[PDB]
Nucleic acid binder design. Structure first.
Ligand SMILES: Nc1ncnc2c1ncn2[C@@H]1O[C@H](COP(=O)(O)OP(=O)(O)O)[C@@H](O)[C@H]1O
Ligand SMILES: Nc1ncnc2c1ncn2[C@@H]1O[C@H](COP(=O)(O)OP(=O)(O)O)[C@@H](O)[C@H]1O
Ligand SMILES: [Mg+2]
Ligand SMILES: [Mg+2]
Ligand SMILES: [Zn+2]
Lengths: 610, 588
DNA sequence: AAAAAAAAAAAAAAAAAAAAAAAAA
DNA sequence: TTTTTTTTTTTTTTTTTTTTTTTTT
C-alpha cells in the first residue's frame, strides 16, 4: 500500500522531533517514562507541519490513525525497544483547533462519518466497564495443546472443542482482555436552543479511557464518527446506528489543574514575607469596592485550612464555611459569582433551585438491572471544592438541616433499604443571605436580624454582616469605583461595539485610578498544597484569645454576638490561622497568622447595636 | 424515453430566464457555498415545460430522481473546475415549492397515494438526525468478493440482501457505505381546520439530506411531499402504515438598504421623540412611560470586567397602577414589538412555565429542560403581567435571574446555569386594588429586595380629572371609528435589533462625574427623608439604581448609535429616574 | 406547632414494535 | 437448507402506592 506507507513515513518523520523544537520527542519520552501507552497529539502541529497530512487524518480517521499509531510504535521501539515490546499497540489521542469538525451532538450530522470530530457535551450515561476479550488461550487436557485465537476489532466464534472433539478449557489468566465502556454524551443545556429536547450521541471508550469521564460532567471527546452494523440477517433497513469511537476524552474543567511560573511564585512569596496575604485579598475581586475583611475571609476560603485525621480515624474538617448577610446591593452575589469564576470545582446554586435530594446526593433504582444506584448531588460533586449558595435564607428548613453533616464533617450519609453509603463531600460552603425584613435593622440585635437558628449559625465559622451604610464619603468612593468600572473597555479589541449574545497586571487608570487573576490562580493553587504546623507560641496565643472570646468581658455594652462562640470557633481560629500561613508559604503557623485570624474573628463575631 | 425527460429537465435548469437565468446562477452560488441543494419553484417548471410539472404531480418518485440527476449534471457543467481534493461531483437534493393552496389533511384518501401532495399542519415532534444509507457495499463471507454501489431507495423502504453469491453469505461493511441525514416528524392537523366535534388527524413526515432540522416542534408548516407507504419486506389485513416523503417545507408564522435606512433614522435630531411617540400611538398619554419603555427596549450594554464578572445591560421596568390604565395593552405591544419577546403572567402562562425547569426522563434518563418564559426570552424582553402574584419558587428564581441574568438549577442529576438575559417589564396593581395616598408606601407588598432589582418603578393614578376623562373617552371612540412620524412595527423591530447587535456605548468622563454628583445627592436626600419619616421607605435607592441610570443613559446613546453617552442623555436618564423617585420620595 | 389535603417520586405492569435465534420439516 | 414461531430487548407509557410537600387551624 503506497498510500499507507507514505502516511506512516510522514507520521514517523513528524514524531522524529529533534531538528525541530523537540516537543513530541519529549512527549514520547514522557509517555515512556511514566508508563503509559497512549499519546496525545495537537492537530495544530499537524496543520503547521503538513496540511495534507492533517486534512487526511481529519477526513479519513480510521486508516490514518492506524498508520499514525504504527509509526508511534515504531518510534517508541527506536527510542526504547524494551518498553515498546511490553505493549501490543500504542494508541493516539488528538486535540487542538478542529476548524469545522468541532461541533455538538446537535450539530453532529452524517456528513462527519469516518472523520475526526472534537465534540463538547454533558455526560449523561456511563455504562459499567466490561473486559472485551481480544485474544483467547485454550488448553486441552487430553492433547496437552494450548491454542491461541485472535479477535480483531470488528466494531466471533469462541472455540470449545478440539479438532477431534477434545474439550478445551479456556485460560483466563493467559487470555488478553481490554477494558471497554460506552457512554452517552449530550449537548450542554446552556448552548442548546431553549425549545426542543436535548440531542445526544454515543461514545465508545477503549482502554486508557474507560473511566476518564464520570456521569454528569462537562467533557470534550475527540474521536472518529462511524456507523455500526446490524446483526446477520437477510433483510436490512437503510438505517444505521452511529457512535463516536473516542481517541481522547478530556475534562472541560481545564481550570481543575512551567519552571518560569514556579520561580515567579517562589520569588513573590519570599520578597515580602509579611503582607502577601493582604495584597492578595485586596486583589481578590478588583471589580468590587470595599469589604476588606470579607475579601480577606474569602481568600481564606480559597486556601482553606488543613484537615486532621487522627489515629482513631476521627475527622476534623479543614475547610472554612462563610455566610454573608447583607442589605440589598452590597455585592454579595457578585462575590459569589467571582468565587464561581475563579475557585476550581465551584458549584453554584440558589435557594429553591436545589430541593432536598438534588442539593445533596440521592439514591434511585437503575430501572434496568433493578439495582439501586447512587446519584451525585449538587454538593458531592463539589468535593475538594466550593459550593456557592445564593439566596440561602429562602431555602426550606429541611434542605438547611440536610447540610449540617457535610458542612461539619464533610460526608453525606444516604441509605435506603437496598443500599447504603457515606459519600465524600469535603466542600466549603459560601452562602449569601438577605436578612429578615429585607433590609438590616441596625436598631435590632444581629440575632433577631437573622432568622437562622443558633446551631446553623454555629455551623458557619465566619458570619459577615455587610450593611448598606450610605456615608457620603463612602458613597462617593463606591460610585467612583463603579462608574470607572462601567466605563472600562477592553484594550484595543473593542472600539465602541457591543458584546455578542505576569505577577502584576498593567496599571490602567480606569481600573486603578494588584496581581493578575491567572497569576493569583496559580499561586493559590500551589499554596493550597502547603501543610503548616501550629507553633507553641501560636497555640498559646490562640488559646488565650478563645478564652477571652468566650468570656463575657470580651463584649462591651450594646455590642451583640453575631454568632455563638463555641468549640468550633476555636477550630476556626486555627483554620483561619492555617489559611493565613498558607498564603505566605510559611509551613509553620507563626504568631502573625494567629493574630490576623484573631482580629478577623473578633471583627466577625461582634456587631455594635445602635 | 427517461433520458429525454432528463434532457428536458436539463434544458429547463440551464435556460429558464427571468434578464437572468435564476436556476443556473442558483446552482453556481449554492455549489460554491457547498449547499449542494436548490429550491425549484413548481410554477416556473410548469410554465417552461408544463408536461414536466404534470409528470411530477402524477409520478413524483422517478421524475424527481431525473430532475436531481439533471441538476447534478448542470451543476457540474457550471462549476466543474475545482481545486484538487474536492473535484468529485456532489449529488444535489432538489427541494420543490409552489404557490398552490394546500389541501386539507382530510382529503388525503387512498387515491392520492404516490402523488405529490401539499398539506398544512403543526409539527408536534421531531426525531434526531440519523444515518440512512444511500449506497451500501456487501461482502461475501465465503468468497470475500464485493458488490459495491448497491443503489438504495429513499424513504422508509429497506432492502433485502442477496441470497446467492453458502446461501446468504453477504454482510454489510459500515466503513464503505455512504449515508445521508435522516429524520422523522409527526404532523398534526391545524386546530382551526379540525371539525368542531372531532379528533385531529395525523401524518408522519420523512425528511432528507438538507430537510432535516429545518423545522422544530411547534412550527406551523406547509409540506409538499410524496404520499407513500412503508416498504419493509411486506383484524386489519393488507394495511401498510402511510407517511409523507417530505420534499418542500415552508414554515408559516437585513439588506444594506435597510441598514442605511436605520443609519439615517438614528441621525435625526429628534430620533428619541419619534421613537417615543411610535410605540403605543393608540394608547393616550403617559409620554414619560413610553420614553422609559423605549429605553428598556434598546437596553444598556452588558459589561464583563477583566475579572470575569458581568454587569447586566438589560433594563428592568415596573409599573404599579390602578386596573384602569392601559398597561396590559402596553405589555402586549412591547412583546409584539421587541425583536425577541414573550408575554406571560405572574404564575407563568397556560402550560408554559415562567422559569426554566430540569427533569430527568426516567426511561431515557436524559436531562430534559422545560423552558420557561425567561429562558425562551433570552436576549429579549419578558412582559410579566400580574407580577405581584408569583409563586415562591418562581419569586426566588426571578430574584436571582433579574440581577445575574442566569438561572442556576441543580437537580438530582446535574448542576447547571441556564443563560436568561431577558429584560423584565412588569405590571401590577396596588395591594388594595386602588392606590390610596392615605396608606402611601403601604400599597406595595413587594419585599424591599425585589424592588431593588427594577431599574425604574412607575406609579399610575386615576384619582381625579374631568378633562382627561373626556379626552380619553373621545380618543378611544376615535380609535374605534378609524380602526407622520410613526415607525411601523416591523421597521421599528428591525431597527431595535440592528441597534442592539451593532452599537454598544460607554459613558464619558464628564457624564460619569455628573451622574456621580447627582447620585450622591439622591442618596443623601433619600437617607434624610427616611430619617425624617422614622421609617424605611419600601422603595430603596442603591448602587443598583446608579447602574440603572447608567443603563438608561447607555440606551439613550445607543438609540443614536453614538459610541459615547453624553451629558444630555445622562440628564434625560436622570429625569426618567426622577419620575420614579417621585414614588421613592414624594410618595412618603 | 401539628394535621389534612395535594403533589410529586418512584416502582411495578402493560403495550408493542422490531431484530435475531432455535426448532421443524 | 429454508422457513417460521418464538425470544428478547429495547422504548415507551401507564397505574398504584408511597412518600414528600403545601396549606390551614
Ligand atoms: N461596594 C461595591 N463595590 C462595587 N460594586 C458594587 C458595590 N455594591 C454594589 N455594587 C454593585 O451593585 C450590584 C448589586 O450586586 P448584587 O450582589 O447582585 O446585589 P445584592 O448584593 O443585593 O445581592 C452589583 O452589580 C455591583 O456591581
Ligand atoms: N390611555 C389609554 N389610551 C387608550 N386606551 C386605553 C387607555 N387606558 C385604557 N385604555 C383601554 O382600557 C382597557 C383596559 O386596559 P388594560 O391594559 O386591560 O388594563 P389592565 O392592564 O389594568 O388590565 C384596554 O382595552 C385599553 O384599550
Ligand atoms: Mg443577591
Ligand atoms: Mg391587567
Ligand atoms: Zn460468495
Amino acid at each position: 500500500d503506497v498510500e499507507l506507507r507514505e502516511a506512516q513515513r510522514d507520521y514517523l518523520d513528524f514524531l522524529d522531533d529533534e531538528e525541530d523544537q523537540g516537543i513530541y520527542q519529549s512527549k514520547v519520552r514522557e509517555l515512556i517514562s511514566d508508563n503509559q501507552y497512549r499519546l496525545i497529539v495537537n492537530v495544530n502541529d499537524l496543520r503547521r507541519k503538513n496540511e495534507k497530512r492533517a486534512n487526511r487524518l481529519l477526513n479519513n480517521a480510521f486508516e490514518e490513525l492506524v498508520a499514525f499509531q504504527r509509526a508511534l510504535k515504531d518510534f517508541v521501539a527506536s527510542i526504547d525497544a524494551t518498553y515498546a515490546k511490553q505493549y501490543e499497540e500504542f494508541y493516539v489521542g488528538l486535540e487542538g483547533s478542529f476548524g469545522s469538525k468541532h461541533v455538538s451532538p446537535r450539530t453532529l450530522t452524517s456528513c462527519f462519518l469516518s472523520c475526526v470530530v472534537c465534540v463538547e457535551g454533558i455526560v449523561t450515561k456511563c455504562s459499567l466497564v466490561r473486559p472485551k476479550v481480544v485474544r483467547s488461550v485454550h488448553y486441552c487436557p487430553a492433547t496437552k495443546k494450548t491454542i491461541e485465537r485472535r479477535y480483531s476489532d470488528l466494531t466471533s466464534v469462541y472455540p470449545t472443542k478440539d479438532e477431534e472433539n477434545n474439550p478445551l478449557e479456556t485460560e483466563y489468566g493467559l487470555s488478553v482482555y481490554k477494558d471497554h465502556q460506552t457512554i452517552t454524551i449530550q449537548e450542554m443545556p446552556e448552548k442548546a436552543p431553549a425549545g426542543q429536547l436535548p440531542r445526544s450521541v454515543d461514545v465508545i471508550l477503549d482502554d486508557d479511557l474507560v473511566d476518564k469521564a464520570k456521569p454528569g460532567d462537562r467533557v470534550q471527546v475527540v474521536g472518529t464518527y462511524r456507523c455500526l452494523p446490524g446483526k446477520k440477517g437477510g433483510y436490512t433497513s437503510g438505517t444505521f446506528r452511529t457512535v463516536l469511537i473516542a481517541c481522547n476524552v478530556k475534562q472541560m474543567s481545564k481550570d481543575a489543574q512551567s519552571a518560569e511560573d514556579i520561580a515567579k511564585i517562589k520569588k513573590f512569596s519570599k520578597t515580602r514575607s509579611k503582607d502577601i496575604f493582604d495584597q492578595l485579598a485586596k486583589s481578590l475581586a478588583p471589580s468590587i469596592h470595599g469589604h476588606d475583611y470579607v475579601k480577606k475571609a474569602i481568600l481564606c476560603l480559597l486556601l482553606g485550612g488543613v484537615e486532621r485525621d487522627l489515629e482513631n480515624g476521627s475527622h476534623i474538617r479543614g475547610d472554612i464555611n462563610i455566610l454573608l448577610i447583607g442589605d440589598p446591593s452590597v455585592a454579595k452575589s457578585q462575590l459569589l459569582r467571582y468565587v464561581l469564576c475563579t475557585a476550581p470545582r465551584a458549584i453554584p446554586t440558589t435557594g429553591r433551585g436545589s430541593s432536598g435530594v438534588g442539593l445533596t446526593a440521592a439514591v434511585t433504582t437503575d430501572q434496568e438491572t433493578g439495582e439501586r444506584r447512587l446519584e451525585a448531588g449538587a454538593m458531592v460533586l463539589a468535593d475538594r471544592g466550593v459550593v456557592c449558595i445564593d439566596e440561602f435564607d429562602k431555602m426550606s428548613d429541611m434542605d438547611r438541616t440536610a447540610i449540617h453533616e457535610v458542612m461539619e464533617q464533610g460526608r453525606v450519609t444516604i441509605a435506603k433499604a437496598g443500599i447504603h453509603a457515606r459519600l465524600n463531600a469535603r466542600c466549603s460552603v459560601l452562602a449569601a443571605a438577605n436578612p429578615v425584613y429585607g433590609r438590616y435593622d441596625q436598631y435590632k440585635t444581629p440575632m433577631e436580624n437573622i432568622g437562622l437558628q443558633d446551631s446553623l449559625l454555629s455551623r458557619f465559622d465566619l458570619l459577615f454582616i455587610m450593611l448598606d451604610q450610605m456615608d457620603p464619603e463612602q458613597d462617593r468612593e463606591i460610585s467612583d469605583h463603579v462608574l470607572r468600572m462601567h466605563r472600562y473597555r477592553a484594550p484595543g479589541e473593542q472600539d465602541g461595539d457591543a458584546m455578542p449574545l505576569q505577577i502584576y497586571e498593567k496599571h490602567d487608570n480606569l481600573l486603578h485610578g494588584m496581581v493578575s487573576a491567572a497569576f493569583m490562580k496559580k499561586y493559590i493553587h500551589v499554596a493550597k498544597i502547603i501543610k503548616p504546623v501550629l507553633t507553641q507560641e501560636s497555640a498559646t496565643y490562640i488559646a488565650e484569645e478563645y478564652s477571652r472570646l468566650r468570656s463575657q468581658d470580651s463584649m462591651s455594652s450594646d455590642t451583640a454576638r453575631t454568632s455563638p462562640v463555641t468549640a468550633r470557633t476555636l477550630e476556626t481560629l486555627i483554620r483561619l490561622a492555617t489559611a493565613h500561613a498558607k498564603a505566605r508559604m510559611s509551613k509553620t503557623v507563626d504568631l502573625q497568622d494567629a493574630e490576623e485570624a484573631v482580629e478577623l474573628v473578633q471583627y466577625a463575631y461582634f456587631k455594635k447595636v445602635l | 424515453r427517461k433520458s429525454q425527460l432528463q434532457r428536458r429537465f436539463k434544458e429547463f435548469l440551464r435556460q429558464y430566464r427571468v434578464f437572468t437565468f435564476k436556476y443556473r446562477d442558483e446552482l453556481k452560488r449554492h455549489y460554491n457555498l457547498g449547499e449542494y441543494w436548490i429550491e425549484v419553484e413548481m410554477e416556473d417548471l410548469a410554465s417552461f415545460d408544463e408536461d414536466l410539472a404534470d409528470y411530477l404531480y402524477k409520478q413524483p418518485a422517478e421524475h424527481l430522481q431525473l430532475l436531481e440527476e439533471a441538476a447534478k449534471e448542470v451543476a457540474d457543467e457550471v462549476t466543474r473546475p475545482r481545486p484538487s481534493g474536492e473535484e468529485v461531483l456532489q449529488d444535489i437534493q432538489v427541494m420543490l415549492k409552489s404557490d398552490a393552496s394546500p389541501s386539507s389533511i382530510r382529503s388525503l384518501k387512498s387515491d392520492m397515494m404516490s402523488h405529490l401532495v401539499k398539506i398544512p399542519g403543526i409539527i408536534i415532534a421531531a426525531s434526531a438526525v440519523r444515518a440512512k444509507a444511500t449506497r451500501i457495499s456487501i461482502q461475501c463471507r465465503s468468497c470475500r468478493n464485493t458488490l459495491t454501489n448497491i443503489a438504495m431507495r429513499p424513504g422508509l423502504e429497506g432492502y433485502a440482501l442477496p441470497r446467492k453469491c453458502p446461501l446468504d453469505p453477504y454482510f454489510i461493511m459500515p466503513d464503505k457505505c455512504k449515508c445521508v441525514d435522516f429524520q422523522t416528524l409527526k404532523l398534526q392537523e391545524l386546530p382551526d381546520a379540525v371539525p368542531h366535534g372531532e379528533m385531529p388527524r395525523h401524518m408522519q413526515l420523512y425528511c432528507d439530506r438538507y430537510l432535516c432540522d429545518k423545522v422544530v416542534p411547534g412550527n406551523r408548516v406547509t409540506i409538499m411531499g410524496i404520499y407513500s407507504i412503508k416498504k419493509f419486506g411486506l383484524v386489519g389485513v393488507g394495511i401498510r402504515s402511510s407517511y409523507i416523503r417530505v420534499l418542500g417545507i415552508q414554515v408559516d408564522t437585513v439588506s444594506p438598504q435597510e441598514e442605511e435606512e436605520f443609519r439615517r433614522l438614528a441621525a435625526l435630531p429628534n430620533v428619541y421623540e419619534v421613537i417615543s411617540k411610535s410605540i403605543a400611538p393608540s394608547i393616550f398619554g403617559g409620554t414619560d412611560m413610553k420614553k422609559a419603555i423605549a429605553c428598556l427596549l434598546f437596553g444598556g450594554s452588558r459589561k464583563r470586567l477583566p475579572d470575569g464578572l458581568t454587569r447586566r445591560g438589560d433594563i428592568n421596568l415596573l409599573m404599579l397602577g390602578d386596573p384602569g390604565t392601559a398597561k396590559s395593552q402596553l405589555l402586549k405591544f412591547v412583546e409584539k414589538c421587541s425583536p425577541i419577546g414573550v408575554y406571560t403572567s405572574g404564575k407563568g402562562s397556560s402550560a408554559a412555565g415562567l422559569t426554566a425547569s430540569v427533569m430527568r426522563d426516567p426511561s431515557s434518563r436524559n436531562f430534559i429542560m422545560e423552558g420557561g418564559a425567561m429562558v425562551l426570552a433570552d436576549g429579549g424582553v419578558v412582559c410579566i403581567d400580574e407580577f405581584d402574584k408569583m409563586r415562591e419558587d418562581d419569586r426566588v428564581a426571578i430574584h436571582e435571574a433579574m440581577e445575574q441574568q442566569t438561572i442556576s438549577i441543580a437537580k438530582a442529576g446535574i448542576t447547571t446555569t441556564l443563560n436568561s438575559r431577558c429584560s423584565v417589564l412588569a405590571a401590577a396593581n396596588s395591594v388594595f386594588g386602588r392606590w390610596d395616598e392615605t396608606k402611601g408606601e403601604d400599597n406595595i407588598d413587594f419585599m424591599p429586595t425585589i424592588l431593588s432589582r427594577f431599574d425604574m418603578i412607575f406609579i399610575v393614578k386615576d384619582e381625579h380629572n374631568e378633562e382627561r376623562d373626556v379626552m380619553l373617552a373621545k380618543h378611544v371612540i376615535t380609535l374605534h371609528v378609524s380602526a407622520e412620524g410613526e415607525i411601523d412595527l416591523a421597521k421599528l423591530k428591525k431597527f431595535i435589533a440592528y441597534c442592539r447587535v451593532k452599537c454598544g456605548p460607554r459613558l464619558s468622563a464628564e457624564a460619569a462625574e455628573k451622574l456621580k454628583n447627582r447620585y450622591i445627592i439622591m442618596r443623601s436626600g433619600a437617607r434624610q427623608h427616611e430619617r425624617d419619616s422614622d421609617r424605611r421607605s419600601s422603595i430603596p435607592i442603591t448602587v443598583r439604581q446608579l447602574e440603572a441610570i447608567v443603563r438608561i443613559a447607555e440606551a439613550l446613546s445607543k438609540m443614536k448609535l453614538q459610541p459615547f453617552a453624553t451629558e444630555a442623555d445622562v440628564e434625560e436618564a436622570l429625569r426618567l429616574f426622577q419620575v420614579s423617585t417621585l414614588d421613592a420620595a414624594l410618595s412618603g
